[PDB]
Amino acid sequence: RFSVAEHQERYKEECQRIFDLQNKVLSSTEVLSTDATGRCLKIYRTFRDEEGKEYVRCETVRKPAVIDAYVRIRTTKDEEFHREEMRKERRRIQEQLRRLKRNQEKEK
Amino acid sequence: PHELESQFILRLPPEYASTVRRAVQSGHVNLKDRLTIELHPDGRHGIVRVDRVPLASKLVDLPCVMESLKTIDKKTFYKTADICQMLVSTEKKFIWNHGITLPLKNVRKRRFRKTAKDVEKEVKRLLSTDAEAVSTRWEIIAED
């Protein structure tokens, strides 16, 4: 039931074997011959055309890679509930400064 | 300022490679007139003209990373540039599977570990279309 020399020697020999296989393969000048849900994603889009129209586009994504990246943003944006917020902050600063100037007028 | 030099590898057909090699090792400026390189605005297509004879070229991506290493004493070597592209002369087509050395052949297919979960750009385009829209309806689907 070795817990000491057996493990150490086994690791050492596997190390020498891999080192020696890599050296040989790399220095070879031999020529080498040239050789979960199963569910797709479909999106419906509603837009307005020039003049007056309301066409709807149904687009199906069968690439599971595109799927993963697409959904992950929605799930994030669904939990994410901004230029508008920055404008609101500037309208808050504007109000605070006016209030401060009113305070200065009251003091003087 | 200093701009890092951009080195790539040029692969020629073997007879044209022998003429270009003889003209390079000769060392005259006669080679300058003989060998020209025209790169097309595709970015992955060209002509290499050896002795005014046009050859069709493709700039391909190499699977490994090479590095040019210069030396003055042949004991200490200084890295000068990274090479990752080759203008072979005679997208998926612009990717080279083999490496330059003989042991590295079919490296991308066999000696490269592949880990997987363009696509990101397509997802960004889809998000932009959803934004330009009004109502979006989504369902993970089944066979249909």
Curated annotation (Swiss-Prot), chain A:
Transmembrane region positions?
none
Which cell locations does it reside in? Nucleus
What's the PTM story here?
Phosphorylated by casein kinase II in vitro.
Self-association and partners = Component of the TFIID basal transcription factor complex, composed of TATA-box-binding protein TBP, and a number of TBP-associated factors (TAFs), including TAF1, TAF2, TAF3, TAF4, TAF5, TAF6, TAF7, TAF8, TAF9, TAF10, TAF11, TAF12 and TAF13. Interacts with TAF7; the interaction is direct. TAF1, when part of the TFIID complex, interacts with C-terminus of TP53.
| Function comment | The TFIID basal transcription factor complex plays a major role in the initiation of RNA polymerase II (Pol II)-dependent transcription. TFIID recognizes and binds promoters with or without a TATA box via its subunit TBP, a TATA-box-binding protein, and promotes assembly of the pre-initiation complex (PIC). The TFIID complex consists of TBP and TBP-associated factors (TAFs), including TAF1, TAF2, TAF3, TAF4, TAF5, TAF6, TAF7, TAF8, TAF9, TAF10, TAF11, TAF12 and TAF13. TAF1 is the largest component and core scaffold of the TFIID complex, involved in nucleating complex assembly.
Q: What remark about domains does the record contain?
A: The Bromo domain mediates interaction with histones that have acetylated lysine residues at specific positions. The second domain also recognizes and binds histones that are butyrylated and crotonylated.
- Identify its protein family: Belongs to the TAF1 family.
Related illness: Dystonia 3, torsion, X-linked: An X-linked dystonia-parkinsonism disorder. Dystonia is defined by the presence of sustained involuntary muscle contractions, often leading to abnormal postures. DYT3 is characterized by severe progressive torsion dystonia followed by parkinsonism. It has a well-defined pathology of extensive neuronal loss and mosaic gliosis in the striatum (caudate nucleus and putamen) which appears to resemble that in Huntington disease. Intellectual developmental disorder, X-linked, syndromic 33: A syndrome characterized by intellectual deficit, delayed psychomotor development, delayed speech and language, and characteristic facial features.
Instruction: Report what the protein is called.
Output: Transcription initiation factor TFIID subunit 1
Output the lineage of the source organism: Eukaryota, Metazoa, Chordata, Craniata, Vertebrata
Q: Which residues of the full protein are shown?
A: 1073 to 1263 of 1893
Swiss-Prot record, chain B:
Q: How is it modified after translation?
A: Phosphorylated by CIITA. Ubiquitinated by TRIM26; leading to proteasomal degradation.
Residues annotated as carrying Phosphoserine in the record are 128
Q: Where is the signal peptide?
A: none
Q: In which tissues is it expressed?
A: Ubiquitous.
Which residues form each disulfide bond in the chain?
Answer: none
Give the record's family classification: Belongs to the TAF7 family.
Additional notes on this entry:
Overexpression of TAF7 in HeLa cells inhibits cyclin D1 and cyclin A gene transcription and causes the cells to accumulate in early S phase. In contrast, depletion of TAF7 from TFIID complexes by siRNAs increases histone H3 acetylation at both cyclin promoters and stimulates cyclins CCND1 and CCNA gene transcription.
Q: What does this protein do?
A: The TFIID basal transcription factor complex plays a major role in the initiation of RNA polymerase II (Pol II)-dependent transcription. TFIID recognizes and binds promoters with or without a TATA box via its subunit TBP, a TATA-box-binding protein, and promotes assembly of the pre-initiation complex (PIC). The TFIID complex consists of TBP and TBP-associated factors (TAFs), including TAF1, TAF2, TAF3, TAF4, TAF5, TAF6, TAF7, TAF8, TAF9, TAF10, TAF11, TAF12 and TAF13. TAF7 forms a promoter DNA binding subcomplex of TFIID, together with TAF1 and TAF2.
Subunit text:
Component of the TFIID basal transcription factor complex, composed of TATA-box-binding protein TBP, and a number of TBP-associated factors (TAFs), including TAF1, TAF2, TAF3, TAF4, TAF5, TAF6, TAF7, TAF8, TAF9, TAF10, TAF11, TAF12 and TAF13. Part of a TFIID-containing RNA polymerase II pre-initiation complex that is composed of TBP and at least GTF2A1, GTF2A2, GTF2E1, GTF2E2, GTF2F1, GTF2H2, GTF2H3, GTF2H4, GTF2H5, GTF2B, TCEA1, ERCC2, ERCC3, TAF1, TAF2, TAF3, TAF4, TAF5, TAF6, TAF7, TAF8, TAF9, TAF10, TAF11, TAF12 and TAF13. Interacts with TAF1; the interaction is direct.
UniProt-recorded name of the protein = Transcription initiation factor TFIID subunit 7
- Source organism phylogeny: Eukaryota, Metazoa, Chordata, Craniata, Vertebrata
User: What gene is it encoded by?
Assistant: TAF7
